Amino acid sequence: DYEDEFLRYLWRDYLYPKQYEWVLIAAYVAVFVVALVGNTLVCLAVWRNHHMRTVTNYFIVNLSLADVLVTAICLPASLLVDITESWLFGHALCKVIPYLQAVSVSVKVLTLSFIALDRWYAICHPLLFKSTARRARGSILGIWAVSLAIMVPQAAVMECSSVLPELANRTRLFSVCDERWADDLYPKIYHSCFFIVTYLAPLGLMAMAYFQIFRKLWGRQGIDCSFWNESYLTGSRDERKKSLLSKFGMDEGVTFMFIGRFDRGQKGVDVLLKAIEILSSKKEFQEMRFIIIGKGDPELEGWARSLEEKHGNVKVITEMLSREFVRELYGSVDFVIIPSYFEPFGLVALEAMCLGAIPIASAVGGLRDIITNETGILVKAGDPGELANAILKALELSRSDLSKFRENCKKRAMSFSKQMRARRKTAKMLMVVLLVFALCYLPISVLNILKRVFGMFRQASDREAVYACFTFSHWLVYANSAANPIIYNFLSGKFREQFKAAF
Numbered sequence: 001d002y003e004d005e006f007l008r009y010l011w012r013d014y015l016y017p018k019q020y021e022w023v024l025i026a027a028y029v030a031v032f033v034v035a036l037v038g039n040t041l042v043c044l045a046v047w048r049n050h051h052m053r054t055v056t057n058y059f060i061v062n063l064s065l066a067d068v069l070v071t072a073i074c075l076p077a078s079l080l081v082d083i084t085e086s087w088l089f090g091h092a093l094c095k096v097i098p099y100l101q102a103v104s105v106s107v108k109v110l111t112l113s114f115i116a117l118d119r120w121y122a123i124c125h126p127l128l129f130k131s132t133a134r135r136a137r138g139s140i141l142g143i144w145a146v147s148l149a150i151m152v153p154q155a156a157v158m159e160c161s162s163v164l165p166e167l168a169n170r171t172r173l174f175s176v177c178d179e180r181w182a183d184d185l186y187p188k189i190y191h192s193c194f195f196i197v198t199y200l201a202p203l204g205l206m207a208m209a210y211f212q213i214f215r216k217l218w219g220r221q222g223i224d225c226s227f228w229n230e231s232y233l234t235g236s237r238d239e240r241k242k243s244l245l246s247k248f249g250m251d252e253g254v255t256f257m258f259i260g261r262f263d264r265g266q267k268g269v270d271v272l273l274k275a276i277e278i279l280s281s282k283k284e285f286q287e288m289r290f291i292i293i294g295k296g297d298p299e300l301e302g303w304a305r306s307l308e309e310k311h312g313n314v315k316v317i318t319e320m321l322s323r324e325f326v327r328e329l330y331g332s333v334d335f336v337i338i339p340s341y342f343e344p345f346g347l348v349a350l351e352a353m354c355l356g357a358i359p360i361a362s363a364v365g366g367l368r369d370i371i372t373n374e375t376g377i378l379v380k381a382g383d384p385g386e387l388a389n390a391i392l393k394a395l396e397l398s399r400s401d402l403s404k405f406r407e408n409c410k411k412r413a414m415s416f417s418k419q420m421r422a423r424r425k426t427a428k429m430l431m432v433v434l435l436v437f438a439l440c441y442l443p444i445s446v447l448n449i450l451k452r453v454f455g456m457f458r459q460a461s462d463r464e465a466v467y468a469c470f471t472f473s474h475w476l477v478y479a480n481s482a483a484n485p486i487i488y489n490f491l492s493g494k495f496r497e498q499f500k501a502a503f
């Protein structure tokens, strides 16, 4: 009967050294040093510099502290156990160290989850985004409490054993540390639940969040503020406007301009032409000048040219223009009209506002976010009557100064063209953090759900291969904590500044 008994009696002193022990050691030591130092720096940057103290960065500090815990405690024990195949610490640590590992996993996952949630409101629902440092402190304490409470079961089940259970002879060369379960099926439940809780579900939810985030952020990387600025224009706006109107063949007046595709139902030139017809009566039409620029279907080009022929203060341009002359136009006219129906970005508003042109535009899409109070006139889309009223309001305003109004336009457009860059880069960094985490913990999660549920990894030569696989998976799990500070290095100048500050 006694095969295991006797073959262990024979083969127990059969120590087999591995060829690349020094490689594994070098790997874990590199990780130890890099992770420890880098997470120290991540904490110090936020703790010294007041401008680093953002909710995002507080959660990142939590991540780094969990990483430091793991690096300080569990990495050495894993190295020793993966080198010697024996548990060289006490029975108490056999419970404590795996407990701390599980808790750190929990904390890292929950912290990434709140980071994703905060960014999700801030980007996808900015009006509902009520977030402060008080909320973050409370949330972090809750994360730690829940993580500590929920991983007590592992600490309970870990045990240090050696010889065969139920064996009279207790002679041994070493003892090991593994999970002791009195139930033969509930372990499957535990490890399934903890695969799903600590990995699957939170990663899927954060994937949803970041999909929606990056979909709100596509195509939003600002305008070239170094090209769109008055610095390359000559003279004063008065002389520039006089000169433009003289080149086109008009006397000085309040100039409105539209540039865009002659599209019916999108860029809204039809609405502008109809509003020009509405204003062709009245009395104040004589004080106004309009320029209409673009290309499209024959109907709208023809109707624009008809209005040009009818009225001497209306000019139409279908020639192909350089970006530089568009710049000069924006810095010469008085207002710009954007009668679009579905404008999703509003690059025209930004480009024209950085040059001082005041925007009159439909209250749709990106425009509503750019054009605020004290910096433009907003109109119900598709209504040429309200557009005519807006033009008349612009005229009444033009009988005054407007200079500070244009400077406000400039400030707004420059701040908006730089905030979305910051959003884009922050989101990129956090997505990369999440990806590194999700890959680092994929192998070992798969291996545990297989070992603990679908009976495997216990037979034939599937015992040396298993050794190699788990050794690598452990190392990778720990390399996570060296990787995250490296991400922070490369993808945020705000941390690079303070990594330099230390030397």
Ligand SMILES: CC[C@H](C)[C@H]1CN(c2nc3cc(Cl)ccc3o2)CCCN1C(=O)c1cc(C)ccc1-n1nccn1
Residues within 6 Å of the ligand: 074, 077, 078, 079, 081, 097, 098, 099, 101, 102, 103, 105, 178, 179, 444, 445, 448, 474, 477
């Ligand atoms: C998070 C607890 C996890 C359930 C651990 C708990 N345990 C255990 N043995 C340990 C020996 C040492 Cl020296 C240090 C820590 C240890 O933790 C044995 C049960 C499997 N288990 C890992 O296979 C496991 C092991 C390590 C080293 C890292 C991650 C792991 N991981 N698994 C699922 C997700 N991440």
Ligand SMILES: CC(C)CCC[C@@H](C)[C@H]1CC[C@H]2[C@@H]3CC=C4C[C@@H](O)CC[C@]4(C)[C@H]3CC[C@]12C
Residues within 6 Å of the ligand: 033, 036, 037, 040, 041, 044, 502
């Ligand atoms: C027992 C021995 C091996 C423990 C070694 C721990 C080492 C890696 C830890 C302990 C204290 C740490 C240092 C604490 C303070 C600073 C100052 C900071 O401006 C740069 C990081 C730096 C320089 C840390 C680097 C990493 C560090 C030196």
Ligand SMILES: CCCCCCCC/C=C\CCCCCCCC(=O)O
Residues within 6 Å of the ligand: 207, 208, 210, 211, 214, 215, 218
């Ligand atoms: C793990 C989850 C990571 C999510 C990845 C980021 C997803 C970003 C998706 C793209 C946004 C879709 C942009 C719309 C394209 C319109 C252009 C066109 O119609 O040709």
